[PDB]
Design a protein around this ligand. Structure first.
Ligand SMILES: [Mg+2]
Ligand SMILES: [Mg+2]
Ligand SMILES: [Mg+2]
Ligand SMILES: [Mg+2]
Ligand SMILES: [Mg+2]
Ligand SMILES: [Mg+2]
Ligand SMILES: [Mg+2]
Ligand SMILES: [Mg+2]
Ligand SMILES: [Mg+2]
Ligand SMILES: [Mg+2]
Ligand SMILES: [Mg+2]
Ligand SMILES: [Mg+2]
Ligand SMILES: [Mg+2]
Ligand SMILES: [Mg+2]
Ligand SMILES: [Mg+2]
Ligand SMILES: [Mg+2]
Ligand SMILES: [Mg+2]
Ligand SMILES: [Zn+2]
Ligand SMILES: [Zn+2]
Lengths: 86, 117, 55, 77, 169, 190, 292, 49
RNA sequence: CACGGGAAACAGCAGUGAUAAAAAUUAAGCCAUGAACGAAAGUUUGACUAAGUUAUAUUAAUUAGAGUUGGUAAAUCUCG
RNA sequence: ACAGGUUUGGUCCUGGCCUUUCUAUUAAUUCUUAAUAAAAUUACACAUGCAAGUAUCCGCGCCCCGGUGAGAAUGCCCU
């Protein structure tokens, strides 16, 4: 558990690394701040004039758990339980 | 459920809590239970005077007269209420009971002045 | 409604016809029907007692 | 409540209803009130019946219903 | 959901978000396509992607596929009048087929918005009853009124026991 | 407690700053329970009369803490900073009595503007505002009203013809009741 | 043809004066938070998103209607003297039908006195809230609108919140809507706090109120100390539109005054404090010309 | 007369549509005629039309 | 199923035997709602209203007792 | 599920069982007062009382309400 954990946290990709490898502006949309486009990262070096190819339907691996969560099929009496502070 | 007969009726369904009554004005079949199934809810009547000294009655007048327009019979307190609103003429018994009350007040006034002596 | 195994109740029809027949045959003459006891104010046929205001 | 085939009580057997004492004046005034009232309410009810007639026929065979029909058929072709 | 090639399309969200709503004339849609050729491509993609979306919002419309019957891909719509719409889809993209079909027999956003507007006037804010159908149950819960006695026990006088115990004596 | 009328004072005191530091009041307190998951509601009340029960809450172990609508420094701790929602009692570890007390107090303080919360942007209630319509604007009073007459003729008590009263006296005879005259115009009090 | 709040001239002047601050317009809100979303954009797409957010902020900036006070409703629909001593309380009959506009609903009251009369304004609104609830409205009027609570909220400079609270709670033509809006304007005037309402949808409210009450002083001083003189001259201009015949408007017609000189004209002819205005205009002019 | 509220409703309603006539709205009782209870009812079954 | 036949019916309110780990009043009113009948005053209604009973559950205070203390899992000392 | 205990001399894996949460009945031990809610072993047998009448006669009502879950995969939704 801890080896796997530290590996997974070490493998993190910073917004800056992403910005730099795609050469694009990575822009965050808060739900509480509405449509306002906060720019988190900018690609130091030369920005692209090429837009990202738009995929109508994306191909991503999905976990049946997250999907079951989103659609409210998780009824577990253990999940919603109130616990003490962090 | 299927019945033999009976009519469309606008009445008072008793919603409520012990010593605290409330009424849902309701378009119902006549033979189904009081608080039970209904065709449509019309309005609501709060018997108890609130903070401002008010009994609140809400009436959906469009649908009320749609249903009376379909030949729905009114209950006596429904009648009394519509007449109190001025949507209907005052029910004769409102007026008659008003008179009976006035005469009771008169005879109690005289009895008061007779007992004082 | 319709379920494929539904049973054919015969005696429903029989009771219907038989009751209609025994209704028409035993149908009371209105002579005995509205017949009245004037002392008790009581119909013999219906066992009904008449209204006071009608006495 | 009781049933058609449920026999009536032994105590309720020899009893029939006793009508109230009639105050002639007030009674008469009342009868008039009710006739007037019921006449009025009858007129109102017929008013409302007419209303329902109108609204139903207009929402069925009326102007914009026909407009909808023709326009939709047109767009279709 | 894990299994499948494009698992996202088995998601409730993806199915909901596909927008085509047939007119009430449409009963049957028949897709006839090919499993080979470069031209038939878009048609295949259509069958693979939007057919599920479509059918989800048009639950009562029969949809049927036929593979490698005709040398060319096409749609056929069967209406209530007996009218047969034949839509040739050949070198057309997936999206183009969808937009073209939505064009022919769709429902204008006006139509749909009016429909949902009629469905949203069905629940009336002023009524009282079950939490399922109504915003409120008692009128105990409306601010200025008298409270549910199971929250705030009533003054002795408004109690029927006190009134009866008074009329008795 | 000496503070009383001025609760906020204690939160600015040096003994408070000494004891709790800059962390919340409840941050160090831990709830003892039978298993991995705590009971879904905390203990009811931790002080019964003179007896203070076991390991007491954050709030009720320190008596100089006062729950009012007034001291916003105390109440702040029991509201989320970012989400502006009140924590449930298990989260903090307060006893049920005091959790309810806190909820009510925070309510009164938000109603007195002493505590910040989200006030959303709403449109006007009406689309078009016109006092024109006959509902809001005065109507041209009926010919019955301008005179001072009952809205319908039969609202007023009218004495019946004597032949009709005698006919009724013949119908209901022996079942009869004392005839009643006109109603008194206005009704007097006791 | 007396100038109104909704006149395109007044609207454009006040939209201009308000200003778009996308950071104050769109601010983190105390509602429940969900994890942020990320997308990869060109400079182009970023510009597009920015402009859309701007339009949304325009919609956000839409002004609350200012109406003069409504006239008290007294109308008696009937009197039945027969019903005089029958009830201790009053019956309130609200027409609830979903199609009817809320200005057009029939709210009637049977009194104990027997008179069938129309409901007053407060009872009418209270009843509409009861039967057609919309969020933000307490049926009983909130404690926060007492003078003590309002003063406390002013001390914490919550004025924008006070105005939103009043907007949702009361009605634009009501007595308390106007009472509170005006009292608030009065305090932002007393304290020189105007910048609080700057990018707010609430700016043109105090704008119009200050033009109609003829105190432009603190707002001009403020606008010029913020180094915005285009807004100060748009403001004097607005003063001239809403006071067409007056010594400053006529003298600005005469002198053919350019914007800065228009502010000088108004400084001279009308404004209660000309010393502060001319000194601040002096300072701004000299300092700005020397710096740039 | 119309009952007071119903009357007011009619008035406001025609006022909305630009009808200025102040002519009093009147309830027509012609078909509101009812027989007294003494009037004998027909025992003959109704022919449905 | 109900012509017929067993046979003599509380699965209306109260009750009672039997049975089960399983235990509400053989109670008061039609005053309010609803229903029936009446042209109507009105009458009837164990529906229902208001009460009686019971820690079954919430809540409020006047009210202190139960369980547990090797680990999971909060908490122990001396004897037998 | 935010999980935890338990296989072995020991580790890892696989894999059950149990613990921790919530509700309802019953039982045991304890029990001061109110209010509200709810009242539930039994389609076995039932003493007694009451539960449908109104109305100038005709008539109109009289498992409608109320009861129960025995039966039937019965059925939900929709024509
Ligand atoms: Mg109850
Ligand atoms: Mg009879
Ligand atoms: Mg029983
Ligand atoms: Mg029975
Ligand atoms: Mg027994
Ligand atoms: Mg016992
Ligand atoms: Mg009754
Ligand atoms: Mg009665
Ligand atoms: Mg009784
Ligand atoms: Mg208990
Ligand atoms: Mg395990
Ligand atoms: Mg092993
Ligand atoms: Mg071992
Ligand atoms: Mg027990
Ligand atoms: Mg029990
Ligand atoms: Mg049932
Ligand atoms: Mg079977
Ligand atoms: Zn309640
Ligand atoms: Zn505590």
């Amino acid at each position: 558990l801890t080896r796997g954990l530290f590996l997974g946290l070490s493998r993190q990709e910073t917004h800056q690394q992403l910005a730099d490898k795609k050469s694009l502006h990575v822009v965050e949309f808060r739900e509480e701040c509405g449509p306002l486009p906060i720019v988190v990262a900018s690609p130091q070096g030369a920005l692209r004039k090429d837009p990202e190819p738009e995929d109508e339907v994306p191909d991503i691996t999905l976990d049946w758990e997250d999907v079951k969560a989103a659609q409210g099929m998780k009824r577990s009496v253990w999940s919603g339980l109130k616990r003490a502070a962090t | 459920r299927a019945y033999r007969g009976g009519h469309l009726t606008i009445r008072l369904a008793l919603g409520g809590c012990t010593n605290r009554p409330f009424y849902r004005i309701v378009a119902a079949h006549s033979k189904c239970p009081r608080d039970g199934r209904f065709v449509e809810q019309l309005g609501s009547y709060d018997p108890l005077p609130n903070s401002h000294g008010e009994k609140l009655v809400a009436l959906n007048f469009d649908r009320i007269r749609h249903w009376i327009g379909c030949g729905a019979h009114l209950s006596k307190p429904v009648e009394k209420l519509l007449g109190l609103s001025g949507f209907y003429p005052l029910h004769p018994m409102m007026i008659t009971n008003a008179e009976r009350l006035r005469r009771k007040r008169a005879r109690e006034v005289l009895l008061a002045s007779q007992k004082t002596d | 409604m319709a379920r494929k195994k539904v049973r054919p109740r015969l005696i429903a029809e029989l009771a219907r016809r038989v009751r209609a027949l025994r209704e028409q045959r035993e149908r009371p003459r209105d002579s005995q029907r509205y017949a009245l006891d004037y002392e008790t104010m009581m119909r013999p046929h219906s066992g009904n007692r008449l209204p006071m205001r009608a006495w | 409540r009781k049933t058609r085939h449920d026999p009536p009580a032994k105590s309720k057997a020899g009893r029939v209803a006793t009508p109230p004492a009639v105050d002639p004046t007030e009674f008469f005034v009342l009868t008039e009130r009710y006739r007037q009232y019921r006449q009025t309410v009858r007129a109102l009810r017929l008013e409302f019946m007419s209303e329902v007639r109108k609204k139903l026929h207009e929402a069925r065979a009326g102007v914009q219903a026909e407009r909808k029909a023709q326009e939709d058929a047109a767009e279709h072709r | 959901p894990m299994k499948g090639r494009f698992p996202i399309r088995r998601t409730l969200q993806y199915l909901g978000q596909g927008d085509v709503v047939f007119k009430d004339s449409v009963k049957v849609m028949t897709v006839n396509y090919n499993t080979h050729g470069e031209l038939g491509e878009g048609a295949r993609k259509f069958v693979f992607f939007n057919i599920p979306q479509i059918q989800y919002k048009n639950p009562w419309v029969q949809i049927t596929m036929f593979k490698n019957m005709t040398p060319s891909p096409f749609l056929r719509f069967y209406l209530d009048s007996g009218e047969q719409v034949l839509v040739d889809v050949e070198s057309k993209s997936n999206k183009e087929i969808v937009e073209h079909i939505r064009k022919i027999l769709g429902k204008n956003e006006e139509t749909l918005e009016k429909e949902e507007q009629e469905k949203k006037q069905l629940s009336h804010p002023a009524h009282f009853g079950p939490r399922k159908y109504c915003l409120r149950e008692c009128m105990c819960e409306v601010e200025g009124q008298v409270p549910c006695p199971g929250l705030v026990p009533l003054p002795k006088e408004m109690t029927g026991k006190y009134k009866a115990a008074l009329k008795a004596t | 407690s000496p503070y009383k009328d001025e609760p906020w004072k204690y939160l600015d005191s040096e003994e408070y700053q000494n004891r709790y530091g800059s962390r919340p009041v409840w941050a160090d307190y831990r709830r003892n329970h039978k298993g991995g998951i705590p009971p879904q509601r905390t203990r009811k009340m931790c002080i019964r009369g003179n007896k203070v029960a076991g390991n007491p809450c954050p709030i009720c172990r320190d008596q100089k803490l006062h729950v009012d609508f007034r001291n916003v420094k105390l109440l702040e701790q029991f509201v989320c900073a970012h989400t502006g929602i009140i924590f449930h009692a298990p989260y903090t570890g307060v006893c049920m009595k005091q959790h309810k007390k806190l909820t009510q107090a925070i309510q009164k303080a938000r109603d007195h503007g002493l505590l910040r919360y989200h006030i959303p942007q709403v449109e006007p209630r009406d689309l078009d505002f016109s006092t024109t319509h006959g509902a809001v604007s005065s109507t041209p009073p009926a010919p019955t009203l301008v005179s001072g007459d009952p809205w319908y003729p039969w609202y007023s008590w009218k004495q019946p013809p004597e032949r009709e009263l005698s006919r009724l006296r013949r119908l209901y005879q022996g079942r009869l009741r004392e005839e009643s005259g006109p109603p008194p115009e206005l009704m007097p009090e006791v | 043809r007396k100038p109104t709040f909704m006149d395109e001239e007044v609207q454009n002047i006040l939209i201009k004066m308000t200003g778009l601050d996308l950071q104050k317009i769109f601010k983190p809100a105390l509602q429940e938070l969900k994890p942020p979303t990320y997308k990869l954009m060109t400079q182009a797409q970023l510009e597009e998103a920015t402009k859309q957010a701007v339009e949304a902020a325009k919609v956000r900036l839409k002004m609350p209607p200012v109406l003069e006070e409504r006239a008290p409703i007294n109308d008696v629909l009937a009197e039945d003297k027969i019903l005089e001593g029958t009830e201790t309380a009053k019956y309130v009959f609200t027409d609830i039908s979903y199609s009817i506009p809320h200005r057009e609903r029939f709210i009637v009251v049977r009194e104990p006195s027997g008179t069938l009369r129309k409901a007053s304004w407060e009872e009418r609104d209270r009843m509409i809230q009861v039967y057609f609830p919309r969020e933000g409205r307490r049926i009983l009027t909130p404690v926060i609108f007492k003078e003590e609570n309002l003063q406390t909220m002013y001390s914490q400079d919550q004025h924008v919140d006070v105005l939103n609270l009043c907007v949702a709670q009361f009605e634009p033509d009501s007595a308390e809507y106007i009472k509170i809006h005006h009292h608030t304007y009065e305090d932002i005037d007393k304290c020189g706090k105007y910048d609080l309402l700057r990018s707010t949808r609430h700016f043109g409210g105090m704008a119009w109120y200050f033009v109609n009450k003829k105190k432009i002083d603190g707002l001009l001083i403020d606008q010029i100390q913020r180094d915005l003189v285009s807004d100060a001259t748009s403001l004097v201009h607005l003063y001239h539109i809403l006071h067409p015949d007056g010594q400053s408007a006529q003298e600005a017609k005469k002198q053919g005054a350019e914007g800065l000189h228009l502010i000088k004209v108004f400084a001279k002819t009308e404004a209660q404090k000309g010393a502060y205005i001319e000194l601040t205009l002096q300072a701004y002019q000299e300092a700005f010309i020397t710096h740039s | 007369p119309y009952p007071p509220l119903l009357r007011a409703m009619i008035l406001a309603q025609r006022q909305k549509y630009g009808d200025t006539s102040t002519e009093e709205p009147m309830l027509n009782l012609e078909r509101a005629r009812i027989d007294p209870w003494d009037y004998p009812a027909k025992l003959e079954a109704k022919t449905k039309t």
